[PDB]
Amino acid sequence: KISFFLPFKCLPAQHRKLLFISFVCAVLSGGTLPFFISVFGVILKNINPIILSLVSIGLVQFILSMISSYCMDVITSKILKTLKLEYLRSVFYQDGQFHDNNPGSKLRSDLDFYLEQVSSGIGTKFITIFTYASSFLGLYIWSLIKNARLTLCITCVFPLIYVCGVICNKKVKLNKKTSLLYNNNTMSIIEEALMGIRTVASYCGEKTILNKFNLSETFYSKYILKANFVEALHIGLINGLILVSYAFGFWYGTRIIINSATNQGASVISILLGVLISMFMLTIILPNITEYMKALEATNSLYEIINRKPLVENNDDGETLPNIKKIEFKNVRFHYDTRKDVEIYKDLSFTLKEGKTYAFVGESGCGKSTILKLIERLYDPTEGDIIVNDSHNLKDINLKWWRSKIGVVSQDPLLFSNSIKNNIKYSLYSLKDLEAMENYLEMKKEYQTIKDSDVVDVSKKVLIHDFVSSLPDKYDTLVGSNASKLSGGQKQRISIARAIMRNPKILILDQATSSLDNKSEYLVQKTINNLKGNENRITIIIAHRLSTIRYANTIFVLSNRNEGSYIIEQGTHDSLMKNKNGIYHLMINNQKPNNLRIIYKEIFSYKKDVTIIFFSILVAGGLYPVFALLYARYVSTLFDFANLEYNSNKYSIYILLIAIAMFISETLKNYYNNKIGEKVEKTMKRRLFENILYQEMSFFDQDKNTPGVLSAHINRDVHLLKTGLVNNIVIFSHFIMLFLVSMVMSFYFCPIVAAVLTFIYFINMRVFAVRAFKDPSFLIQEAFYNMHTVINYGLEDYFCNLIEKAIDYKNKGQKRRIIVNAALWGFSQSAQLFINSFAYWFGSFLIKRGTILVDDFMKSLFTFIFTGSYAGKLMSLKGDSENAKLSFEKYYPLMIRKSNIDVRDDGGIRINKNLIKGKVDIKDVNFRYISRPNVPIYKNLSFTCDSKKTTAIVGETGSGKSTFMNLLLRFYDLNGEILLDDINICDYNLRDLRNLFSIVSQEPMLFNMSIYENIKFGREDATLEDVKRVSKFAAIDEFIESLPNKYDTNVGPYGKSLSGGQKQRIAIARALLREPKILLLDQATSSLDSNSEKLIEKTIVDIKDKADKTIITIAHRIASIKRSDKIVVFNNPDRNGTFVQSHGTHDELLSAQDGIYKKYVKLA
Ligand SMILES: Nc1ncnc2c1ncn2[C@@H]1O[C@H](COP(=O)(O)OP(=O)(O)OP(=O)(O)O)[C@@H](O)[C@H]1O
Ligand SMILES: Nc1ncnc2c1ncn2[C@@H]1O[C@H](COP(=O)(O)OP(=O)(O)OP(=O)(O)O)[C@@H](O)[C@H]1O
Ligand SMILES: [Mg+2]
Ligand SMILES: [Mg+2]
C-alpha cells in the first residue's frame, strides 16, 4: 500500500473541521431509510401527528445532507490549487540538466493528466460511498439478529473479490504508461508547428505533420481501449458473484420451509427481501472505490516530482563577499549529458581582473556560449574549478547574490509580451527583493518605487528614445508573442537597455551588435565604453566582426585543430597581427446555441455500436424488480405441498440464469461507452487542428489566439467530451429503464396508486435536467519558452504570485454554482419520504372507504424503492458536462472559420519550373500594419531586379527590409503592385509560387526530428546521396561525420541542442536542396566566422558564374556587397515613409551625391 488520506494531508486547521462536519453529516442522512422502514412497518398495521413526524424527519434529512455537499466542494478547489502551484515552483529551481531531458511539452501533459484523475476521484463521489455504506449496515445488522447463519455466507466470499482487483489493476498501469508516452509525443508536434508557422507555410510542409499526428493518435487509441476493457469486466463480474451467493442463500433458506411446513407468507421472505436491498446498495458503492484508488497513485506521482532534489541547489546557505575580483579557471573539463562521448575542452584556464575589457575569438563550434552558461552556474564542471578572488569557490557562494550583479545579452534575445517599460524595469525586482525581504510582505509595494526617470535616460543611451517617442503609447504599447511586432535591432537595443539599468559589476555581451549598422554600432560602443562606474567592472565581449574589439587589454584566440578546443594566442591588437603569420593575421587580412447538434449527429451514425449498448442497458436496468415475480409465484405455491422440492430447485436455477446475464450486460454496457466516446474525440481533435493549420498570418498576430492557448483548448476541451457528455447520457438511460420497468410491475398489483405517483416521479425527474488578469496557460507557456531569462534575472516568485491572481479570477461563479448543486443533492436524498407520506395519506381514506385492501397497496408501494434510491447517481457528472458545453461553445468558431489566403484553392495560372525569367518589378507601394494603423512605412517604392543578377539592399534599422520578403510570399496582402514577369502575384495559384522561392530567414528554426528529416523538409522523395552532396556547399559535412548517428542524430526541441552557426548552415543546406529558381537571403552570415563565410561566398559566386538562378541578399557587412551588380538604399528623413535614393552604386559610386553609403564604406 501507499496510504489513504494523502490529498487531505497539507491543509490548515480551518478546512479539517469542515471535513469532519461533511463526514459526520452524511452518516446521519444515510441512517434514515431503515429508520423510516422500522417506523412505517409498525404504523401501517395499526392522522396529522404521524404525517408531521414524517415530514419533519424528511426536513432534517434535507438540512443535514445540504451541508456535506457545500463543505466538500470548497476543499476540492483548494487542493487542486495547492497541487498546481507547488508543482510549477519546483520546476524553476531545477538545474539545467533537468531541462535537457524533460522538455516543456512533457510536463504540461503529465500535469493536466494527473489533475483530471484527482478531480474525478475526490468530488461528489467521496461522500456517496459513506452515505450509502450506512444504509448497508442499517439493513444488514437488522437481518443479522433474527438469523445470522443464513446471512454469514457472503463474508466467506469477501476475500475472493479482493483477488480480481489485484490482477485487473496490474494489467492496466502498463498500458496507461505506454499511452502517456505517445500523448507526450503528439503534444510536442502542435507547439513546434504553431511557433514555426512562417516556415511551414513557406515550404509547404503542412501535410507531413498530419501523418505524424495521426500515427501517434492511432498507436494511442489502441492501447487506451485495451486498458479500459478490463475495468468493464471487473465490475461486471462482481455483480454476478454477488447474485450467485444470493442464490445459494435462497436455496439454503427454502430448506427450513420444506422441513417445517411438511413435518409440522412467512418471515423468511421478509428477511431475504431485506437482504436484497443491501446488495442493491453494494451495486452503487463499488464503482466509485476504483476511481478513488486511481487518485492515490496520481497524487503520489505528483509529490514525487514536487519532492525532487537537484544537484545545484538554490538554498540560502551561501556567502556574501564585499566585492568581486579575480575570476580564475584552473584545468576545466566539461561534456554534455546526451552526448557522453563528445569532449569539448582540453586544458581551459585563464585569469580576469577588474577595470578591463576582454574578447573571445574562434570557430563556430568551440565553447564560447558554453563558457557563458558555465560562469552563471547553470551547469558545473567535471574536474576543474572557478575559484573567485583566490580564496572562495563558486560552489560555495550564494547564487542569488552572485546573480544580483551580472548583466547578460544573449545570442538569442527573449522578451515577454506585456510592454516595454515593464520589461525594462524587471531588472530591478531581484534587487529590491534583496533590500526588503532580508531586512524584516514588503516586496509587492516597493515595486512602485521604481520611477520612470531611469527608463528615459537609459533609452536615450541606446538611440531608441527617438523612435519610441514618435509612435502612440510611447512606453505603454505592447509587443506580441516573442516580440514578433518589433524588429531585430530594436529587440537588441531593448535587451541592452535592460542590462544597463541595474549597473552590473559584470557584463557579458554575446553577439549583441549583429543586426546593427556601422554608425549606430560605433555610437553605442562609444556610449558603453564611457559609462559611469566603468573604473571598476568586467565586460566580456564576444564577436565575429573583429573591428569592434580593436581596443582591448587582451584577446583570447582558441581552436580545435579533434578531441578538444584550446587557446593558442594571447595579446593585444597591435602585438598579435605583426608577430607571426598565424590565424589572426589571416583573419584581419580577410576582412581588412444549438451547436451541440453537431455532436449527436456523429453519435447516431455507428449503428451497430449504439444497438448492442441499448439491448444491454435494457437487460441490466430491469432485472432487480423482476425478482418481485419470483417471490410472488413462489409464495402462491407454498400450501400445495408434495411437489415443493421441484419448485425450490427450479427457482434457484432461474436465479443462476439471471446471474449469468447480469455479467454480459454490464461489461458490454461499460466497454462500448468508452469505445463510442474515443471515436468522437479523435475526429473533433483532428478537424480543429487541421483547420487552424491553414489560416493566415494576421490570425496569429491577434492577442488571444496565442500558441499557449490553442493547445490547451485542443487537448483538454476535446478530452472532456468522452467522460462527461457520453457517460451522463448512459446514466440517464439506465435510470429511465428502471422507472419504465417499475411502472409496469406496479400495475400488476394495483394500478390506481401507480397512475397517481408516476406523475409525481415524472415531475421530480424533470427537475434534474432543466436547471442549468489573463489565462493561466498563457503565462505557463510564456515562462517555459523563456526559462533562461527567468533564471538570469530572478523571476520565479513573481510569476508564481502572478498566476494565483488568474486562478482566482477564473473562479467567480465557483461560489454560486455550489449551493445549487447542494440543494439538488439534498432534494435527491429527501424526495423519497415526502412521497411515501403523501401515499399513506391518500391511501388511508380509500382503505377506510372500503375499496382497496392493505396488502396490495403495501406491495405496490414497496417496489418503487429501487428507482427512488438510484437517484443519487444523477448528480455525479454535472459540472464536467457543463464545462464541456461551455468550452465547445467557445472553440466551435475556430473549427468552422475559413481563411482569406488558402493554399488549398486549386484555381489560377499554373507555372512551370522550366521557362522562367525571374524579373521582379515594383510600380508603387503603400503599406500599413493593422496592429497600429498610424505608422506609415513605405511611400512610392521603385526598383527592379532584372534576371539572373545579384541585388543588394542596405538601409537603416526599422526601414522595412524584412517586410518586402513577407509581402513577396503572401503573408500579407496589399495599394500598389508587385509584378513577377509583368503579372501580379495575386493570380498565380500560390502552391507553385511558394515552390520556386527559397528563403533563409533572419531567425532559423528546427524541429525535434533528426537532421536527415529536417533537411528533407518539404521534399520527401530524396536519397541520402543528395543530402551528402548539398551538405558540402554548406561547409558542414565534417562535423556531422565526426558524430555518433551521423545523419540519424536527434536535435533538441527548437534546435536548442545545437549552436547558432550550425543551425544556420543546416538551413542553408535545406534551402539549396530544393533546386530553387529564386534565392532570398536575409543575414545569412551573421553568426559565421570568416573562414566558413568565405567558403559559402565561394559557393555563391560559383553559382553566380553560371545562369539559371536569381539571387537577392540583405547584409550589413560592406565586404560582401561590392561584388553585387546593383545596390539599393532606403532612407527615412522625416518619419512618414521610405523611398529610394541611390541605385546601382556597385562600389564605384560611393560618394557622388550626399548619402549615407559613403559613411558605411569608411566606418568599417
Ligand atoms: N544541450 C546540449 N546538449 C549537447 N550538446 C550541446 C548542447 N548545446 C550545445 N551543445 C554542443 O556544444 C558545442 C559547443 O557549442 P557552443 O555553445 O560553443 O556554440 P558557439 O561556439 O557559441 O557557436 P557560435 O560560435 O556559432 O555561436 C556544439 O558543438 C554543440 O553541438
Ligand atoms: N507584426 C507586426 N505588426 C505591426 N508592425 C510591425 C510588425 N512587424 C514589423 N512591424 C513594423 O515594421 C517596421 C520595420 O520592420 P522590419 O522588421 O521589416 O525592419 P527591418 O529592416 O527588418 O529591421 P532590421 O534591419 O533591424 O532587421 C518596424 O518599425 C515595426 O514597427
Ligand atoms: Mg553561440
Ligand atoms: Mg531583420
In DSSP notation, 610-664 reads HHHHHHHHHHHHTTSTTHHHHHHHHHTTSSS-SSHHHHHHHHHHHHHHHHHHHHH
Tell me how far the alpha carbon of residue 486 lies from the centroid of ligand 2, in angstroms. Answer: 5
C-alpha to C-alpha distance for 8 and 1040, rounded to whole angstroms: 54
Ligand 2 centroid to residue 960 C-alpha, Å: 6
Residues 394, 397, 399, 404, CA torsion sign: negative
> Does residue 711 have its Cβ closer than 6 Å to ligand 1?
no
If one residue of 198, 486, 1160 were mutated to test the ligand 2 pocket, choosing by the most ligand atoms within 8 A of its CB, it would be 486
The CA–CA distances, whole Å, from 661 to 101, 245, 629 equal: 51, 15, 17
Question: 543: which DSSP letter?
Answer: -
Where on the phi/psi map is residue 921: left (φ > 0), alpha (ψ -120 to 50), or beta? beta
Known binding residue 957? Answer is: yes
Give all strands of the β-sheet with 506-510 in edge-to-edge order.
406-409, 506-510, 538-542, 356-361, 555-559, 566-571
- Reading the block at residue 436, the C-alpha cell is 526588503
Question: Strands 997-1000, 327-332: parallel, antiparallel or unpaired by DSSP?
Answer: unpaired
Pick from 628, 651, 625, 626: nearest CA to 638:
651
Q: Which atom of ligand 1 is nearest to the CA of 411?
A: 27
Query: What's the rounded Cα separation, in Å, for the pair 1064 and 1089?
Result: 12
Give the C-alpha separation, 692 to 685, whole Å. Answer: 11
Q: Is 1039 in the pocket of ligand 1 (CB under 6 A)?
A: no
Q: Whose CA is nearest to atom 16 of ligand 2?
A: 960
Distances (CA, A) of 6 to 133, 292, 829, 1086: 22, 12, 29, 55
| 361, β-bridge pairs | 557
Determine which residue's CA is closest to atom 1 belonging to ligand 1: 1057
Query: How many Cβ atoms sit within 10 Å of the Cβ of residue 1133?
Result: 9
Nearest to 993 by CA among 1026, 969, 964, 966: 969
Per-residue cell: 361: 575569438
Q: CA gyration radius for the chain?
A: 39
Nearest to 1038 by CA among 368, 562, 558: 562
The DSSP string of 85-150 is HHHTTTTTSS-HHHHHHS-HHHHHHHHHHHHHHHHTTSSTHHHHHHHHHHHHHHHHTHHHHH-STT
CA distance readout (Å), 939 to 790, 923, 924, 962 = 41, 11, 8, 16
**C-beta neighbour count of 183 within 10 angstroms:** 17
8 A C-beta contact, residue 776 and residue 801: no
570/773 Cα distance (integer angstroms)? 54
* 8 Å CB contact between 956 and 1130: yes
The residue type found at 183 is N
Paired with 565 in beta bridges are: 345
Residue 627 Cα, ligand 4 centroid: separation in angstroms? 81
Contacts of residue 240, Cβ cutoff 8 Å, sequence gap at least 6: 659, 660, 662, 663
Half-sphere exposure in the Cβ direction for 357 (13 Å, CA)? 15
Cα separation, 730 vs 735, in Å, equals 9
Q: Quick check: 342 and 335 in contact, CB under 8 A?
A: yes
Contact 1087, 511 (CB under 8 A): yes
Whether residue 93 contacts residue 312, with contact meaning beta carbons closer than 8 Å, is answered with no
Strand partners, 358: 540
Q: What is the atom index within ligand 1 of the atom nearest the CA of 336?
A: 4
Where do we find the cell 522550366? 914
Neighbour tally for 530: CB within 10 Å: 8
Resolution given for this structure, in angstroms: 2.9
Q: Is there a binding annotation on residue 1098?
A: no
Say which ligand is closest to the CA of 1083: 4
Query: Is residue 279 packed enough to be buried (19+ CB in 10 Å), middle (13-18) or exposed (0-12)?
Result: middle
Nearest residue to 391 (alpha-carbon basis) of 318, 312, 321: 321
Q: Is 359 helix (H, G, I), strand (E, B) or coil?
A: strand
487 is in an annotated binding site: yes
CB 981 within 8 A of CB 917: yes
Residue 543 Cα to ligand 1 midpoint, Å, equals 16
Distance of CA 211 to the CA centre of its chain: 21
Considering all CA atoms of the chain, what is the largest pairwise distance in Å, rounded to the nearest integer?
Answer: 135
DSSP string, 948-1017: S-EEEEE--TTSSHHHHHHHTTTSS---EEEEETTEEGGGS-TTTHHHHEEEE-SS----SSBHHHHHTS
Handedness of CA 533, 534, 535, 537 (dihedral sign): positive
What cell does 18 get? 469542515
Cα–Cα distance for residue pair 1046/1050, rounded to 1 Å: 10
Instruction: Evaluate whether 1112 touches 514 at the Cβ level (below 8 Å).
Output: no
Count Cβ atoms within 10 A of the Cβ of residue 702 and give its class: 0-12 exposed, 13-18 middle, 19 or more buried: exposed
Q: Are strands 348-352 and 327-332 parallel, antiparallel or unpaired?
A: antiparallel
Give phi and psi for 1130, each to the nearest 5. -100, 145
**Spatial CA neighbour of 562 closest among 1032, 1037, 1042, 1092:** 1042
Where residue 981 falls (left for φ over 0; alpha for ψ -120 to 50; beta otherwise) is left
How many CB atoms neighbour CB 284 within 10 A?
16
H or E stretch at 1079: strand 1078-1081
Parallel, antiparallel, or unpaired: how do β-strands 983-984 and 976-980 relate? antiparallel
CA-CA-CA-CA torsion sign (776, 782, 784, 789):
negative
Distance, first Cα to last Cα, the chain: 73
828/821 Cα distance (integer angstroms):
10
Residue labelled with grid coordinates 575589457: 357
Q: Identify how many contiguous H helices and E strands the chain contains and give both numbers.
A: 45, 18
Tell me, in angstroms, the distance from the centre of ligand 1 to residue 370's CA.
Answer: 7
Burial class (CB in 10 A: 0-12, 13-18, 19+), 509: buried
Nearest CA owner, ligand 2 atom 2: 485
Q: Across the strands, what pairs with 284?
A: none
764-781 b/e (C-beta count within 10 Å ≥ 16 → b) = bbeebeeeeebbbbbbbb
Contact call for residues 685 and 604 (beta carbons, < 8 A)? no
The answer to whether the beta carbons of residues 140 and 151 sit under 8 Å apart is: yes
Buried b (16+ CB within 10 A) or exposed e, 16-46: eebbeebeebbbebbbbbbebbeebeeeeee
SS3 753: helix
CA distances from 676 to 480, 607, 939 (A): 41, 11, 60
Cell of 770: 432543466
d(CA 216, CA 384): 45
Residue 345's alpha-carbon distances to 264, 875, 1123, in angstroms, are: 104, 65, 39
Q: Which three cell numbers stand for residue 679?
A: 471515436
Question: What's the CA-to-centroid distance between 954 and ligand 4, angstroms?
Answer: 11
Angle 823-829-834 from CA coordinates, rounded to 5°? 100
875 Cβ neighbours under 8 A, 6+ residues apart: 124, 768, 821, 824, 825, 828
Residue 1108, Cβ density class (10 Å: 0-12 exposed, 13-18 middle, ≥19 buried):
exposed
Q: How many CA atoms lie within 13 A of 1036 on its CB side?
A: 27
Q: What domains sit in the chain, N to C, each tagged with a CATH number? A: 13-309+599-896 (1.20.1560.10), 323-404+550-592 (3.40.50.300), 920-1162 (3.40.50.300)
The 3-state DSSP composition of the chain as helix, strand, coil percent (nearest 5) reads 55, 10, 35
User: Residues 197, 640: contact at Cβ < 8 Å?
Assistant: no
Q: Cell numbers of 1138, please?
A: 521610405
Binding residue per annotation — 370?
yes
CB atoms within 10 A of CB 719: 19
CB-ligand 1 contact for 367 (6 Å cutoff): yes
**Break positions in the chain: residue before each gap, C to N over 2.5 angstroms:** 46, 264, 440, 561, 592, 772, 974
**Which cell is 546 given?**
573583429
C-alpha cell at 135: 444504509
Question: Is the CB of residue 337 less than 8 Å from the CB of residue 100?
Answer: yes
In the reported structure, the alpha carbon of residue 180 is separated from the centroid of ligand 3 by a whole-number distance in angstroms of 35
Which of helix, strand or coil describes residue 781? Answer: helix
Look-up of cell digits 411502472: 743
Question: What is the DSSP code string of 144-167?
Answer: HHH-STTTTTSTTTHHHHHHHHHH
- Phi, psi (deg, nearest 5) at residue 332: -95, 145
Rounded alpha-carbon distances, angstroms, from residue 576 to 366, 368, 941: 21, 21, 47
Q: Indicate the helix (H) or strand (E) that contains 253.
A: helix 208-263
Q: For residue 783, how far is the Cα from the chain centroid? A: 12
Question: Distance between CA 546 and CA 1091 in Å, rounded?
Answer: 13
Q: Is 339 annotated as a binding residue?
A: yes
CA distance 800 to 989: 49
* CA 1163 to chain centroid: 49
Find out whether 489 is annotated in a ligand binding site. yes
Q: Left (φ > 0), alpha (ψ -120 to 50) or beta: where does 815 sit?
A: alpha
User: CA-CA distance, 959 to 974, in Å (whole number)?
Assistant: 18
Alpha-carbon span 1016 to 1011, nearest angstrom: 8
Residue 404 corresponds to which cell in the numbers above? 544580483
Q: Is the CB of 1058 under 6 A from ligand 1?
A: yes
φ, ψ of residue 925 to 5 degrees: the values are -140, 135
Q: Which residues contact 201 (CB under 8 A, 6 or more apart)?
A: 697, 903, 969, 971, 994
Technique used to solve these coordinates: cryo-EM
CA-wise closest residue to 869 among 767, 742, 778 = 742
DSSP 8-state assignment for residue 355 = S
